[PDB]
Amino acid sequence: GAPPIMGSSVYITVELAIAVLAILGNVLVCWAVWLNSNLQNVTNYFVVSLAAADILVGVLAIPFAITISTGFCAACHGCLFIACFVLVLAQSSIFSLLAIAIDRYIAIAIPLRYNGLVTGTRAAGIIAICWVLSFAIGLTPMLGWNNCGQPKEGKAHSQGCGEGQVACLFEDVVPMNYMVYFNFFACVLVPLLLMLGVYLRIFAAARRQLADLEDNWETLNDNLKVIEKADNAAQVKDALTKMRAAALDAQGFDILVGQIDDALKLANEGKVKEAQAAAEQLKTTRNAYIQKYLERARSTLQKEVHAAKSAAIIAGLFALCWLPLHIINCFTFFCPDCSHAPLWLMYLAIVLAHTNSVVNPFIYAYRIREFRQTFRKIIRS
Amino acid sequence: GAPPIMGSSVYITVELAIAVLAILGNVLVCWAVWLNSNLQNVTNYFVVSLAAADILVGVLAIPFAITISTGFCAACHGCLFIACFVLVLAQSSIFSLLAIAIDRYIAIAIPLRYNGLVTGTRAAGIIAICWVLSFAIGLTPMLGWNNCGQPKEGKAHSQGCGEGQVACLFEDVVPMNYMVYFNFFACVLVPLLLMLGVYLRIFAAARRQLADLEDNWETLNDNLKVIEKADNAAQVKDALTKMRAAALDAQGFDILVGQIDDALKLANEGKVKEAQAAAEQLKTTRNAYIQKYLERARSTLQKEVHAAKSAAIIAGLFALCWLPLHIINCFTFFCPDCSHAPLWLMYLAIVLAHTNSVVNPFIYAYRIREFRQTFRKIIRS
Ligand SMILES: CC(C)CCC[C@@H](C)[C@H]1CC[C@H]2[C@@H]3CC=C4C[C@@H](O)CC[C@]4(C)[C@H]3CC[C@]12C
Ligand SMILES: CC(C)CCC[C@@H](C)[C@H]1CC[C@H]2[C@@H]3CC=C4C[C@@H](O)CC[C@]4(C)[C@H]3CC[C@]12C
Ligand SMILES: N#Cc1c(N)nc(SCc2ncc[nH]2)c(C#N)c1-c1ccccc1
Ligand SMILES: N#Cc1c(N)nc(SCc2ncc[nH]2)c(C#N)c1-c1ccccc1
Ligand code: NA
Ligand code: NA
């Protein structure tokens, strides 16, 4: 049984190292968005809300975690504030991650109405609502769902606490049924599962749109071959009618549709050879115009998929960092006779959850050019 | 390719956290030995030499590691000093660990001559020799075994280095054949293997001595039973002669040997019943005296085994922390075409080796009462 200040010196130093990084990296995220007008869009306002939560993890949650780990004497409700504040930040993070996923789904599924649906001032209103909701969720124990009515009086007397005070220990004041059913299952697990569903729908929408672009491109080229190897005017007409509906479906295009109409008129006059010659002109338009549109549309979809993968990595890292702590609480709660969860593992799980506040600035720097470039310029300046 | 200052900010913060802990813990080790005269013995003078090396890891090696990781412009030999200084500390640690193992072997194998062989002033002389040898081993590259004759001129010109300067990078100035054959195989691996051999001999010596104590105890009790179930004076004499040689072998004992002689005289006179009655008196002496010696001797051996296990854990942790770095160097050296050792893994291996400077104060606190108690009193004061 080595002096408690030794093992806790490792814990405290690790916590403070994480706080330094959480503050530095996320201040840099906010700074980049403030300076670069190319980074000022709705998606990045939620990115700023998420970085603000991570800055408060370093400034407030980590000092609070170090404090409550001592078990210092405190009035139960004051204790309950420094125990639960991290839950407010985690909840705010969940709401920002969920909003980012929904923003990306609107952008890929209905890009025509994105600008009119997703407004900068509406994003600020959603963020405000989400922060107020997060306070209500994270601080629900202070509203009455707590163990303040059944204080551990033996622990309070041992530590020489005053009347009306308890030894401030997280597990003594925050109910385990709140942590597992309310915080984990309802407020963390359900939103993360919803996020997963949204990301699946984003990638499936992108996969289908790319297939539809290639399907229309193939239909155009295949029907040109059908016209070349046709012997009757009815066969030329059949392929041209299918090409015309496909050209409007994919909507340079004025020349294309006009040239299809020119050949269709010749086909209807029974001039097969003349219709096939008119259809050959379509190849020049396809090369000079249509292929450029196809390649630009494909490149736009790939950029959207790349941005959605970056956002999903951010969400995936939140799940990876927070799940161990939640899972440990599930074992403590659901298996009361399980000899499990040593204190070193509980501190490792807490340290891992705090680590999530360090990782997002790295993901933006490694995956997003505009962020990476702005970070270089801020470090230079 | 995120800005280099970001990933290196994680590395630097982790290195500085380790330096804080290496200094704090090992200052506490030195403080305890200085204050408590129960901790002032030869074994703990080597413990202080090992803690002094760990304090210099925090004060000098870690700031040097951070510095050379930038690749700053430097005169090749100056570069070679801040590259190799950590090797001096690692070598000094190896010598202290080896001395601690040899000290414990002398204590268990020849406890009668330990005080006369192992002197405090001789320990200070060995430590002095070991530190001078460590400087020669660790700084052998500065004596000429270096890549200063073949500077990477393209790297020096790129960084705008002056004439006579190189980009200070460990792998550019310290030869890989020095690191693998000389530093690893000869100066690290051979001494660690020697340490393992010494620890095996310590535990085998302890195991044999405990078996010899129980063998003499069993021989005493079994021969008492032989005397009780004897019918002739020759049988009583045979068991008493074996008991007498065993009593001197285990050397209260004056009473025991005298009572054996009393019964032996009766046996030689052909007085069987009288000899068996005289031998029954041995039981009172065995209970009042001999069993107390047996239990104290057994308890002393168990304390020595416990102390040797603690010292072996210290050595085992050095091997566990330093081996990954050495093994990575072996892959780089022996397999030049092996696409291996990413830079994040090289930093993880360096961070793990530095971590070894933090762990020893914890092992003493968790395993050694006199250290643990002194640490409490230093923290109280
Ligand atoms: C994607 C979702 C479903 C993953 C979230 C993790 C949850 C639902 C799972 C994963 C492992 C599960 C635990 C596995 C082991 C036990 C021990 C048993 O005595 C009580 C239930 C308990 C404690 C389970 C509770 C629920 C649990 C924590
Ligand atoms: C107890 C002692 C023997 C353990 C010390 C580790 C040393 C001797 C061993 C363990 C794993 C070994 C390495 C395993 C793989 C390779 C790849 C091969 O292409 C070159 C040799 C090399 C690089 C070996 C060199 C020696 C090595 C590093
Ligand atoms: N779940 C849980 C939990 C806990 N069971 N304990 C503590 S603090 C005392 C402690 N740390 C290690 C051992 N004992 C904390 C804190 N902060 C938490 C916690 C909860 C949510 C978010 C972040 C952390
Ligand atoms: N072996 C090796 C080694 C190395 N190959 N490089 C570096 S420093 C640049 C670096 N760190 C990460 C990537 N690149 C260092 C240092 N210090 C060492 C080293 C050697 C002995 C002891 C402790 C560390
Ligand atoms: Na967060
Ligand atoms: Na060391």
UniProtKB/Swiss-Prot annotation, chains A, B:
Keywords: Cell membrane, Disulfide bond, G-protein coupled receptor, Glycoprotein, Membrane, Receptor, Transducer, Transmembrane, Transmembrane helix, Ubl conjugation. GO terms for biological process: adenylate cyclase-activating G protein-coupled receptor signaling pathway; adenylate cyclase-modulating G protein-coupled receptor signaling pathway; apoptotic process; apoptotic signaling pathway; astrocyte activation; blood circulation; blood coagulation; cell-cell signaling. The keyword Transcription does not apply. Residues 4-9, 69-79, 146-175, 335-342 are extracellular. Receptor for adenosine. The activity of this receptor is mediated by G proteins which activate adenylyl cyclase. Belongs to the G-protein coupled receptor 1 family. This is Adenosine receptor A2a. It comes from Homo sapiens. The chain holds residues 2 to 305 of 412 of the full protein.
